[PDB]
Amino acid sequence: HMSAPGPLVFTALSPDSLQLSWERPRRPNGDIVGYLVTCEMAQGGGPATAFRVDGDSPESRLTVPGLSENVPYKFKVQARTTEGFGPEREGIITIES
Structure with missing residues (x-):
């Protein structure tokens, strides 16, 4: 999926927060103006949070x-x-400690 962001890289920061990074799509289908990051419990049924990322970068x-x-x-x-x-x-990411 070369039009998709690179594999997600998770850097857990704390019990309740992480940094997510991703490389821009190797082959964007169009001009990238940003990203949408949506987070929710993997098991489903949970609240989702959407993060609108403004702009593009080799790595975001x-x-x-x-x-x-x-x-x-x-x-x-x-x-x-x-x-x-x-x-x-x-x-998918799980933070443990």
Whole structure:
């Protein structure tokens, strides 16, 4: 999926927050203007948080708070282009300590 963001890289910062990073799509389908990051418990049924990332970068980083430990979170990152959204890159992360 070359139009999708690179694989998500999770850097857990604390019991309740992590940094998510991703490389821009190797082959964007359109002009990337930002990203959409959506976070929710992987098990579903939970609240989702959407983060609108403004702009593009070879690698983008986002700190995502309001998490918890021992709960897998599913992150979905899509490039925002001038024409729409690119395909999602998904990544699941659990923070333990």
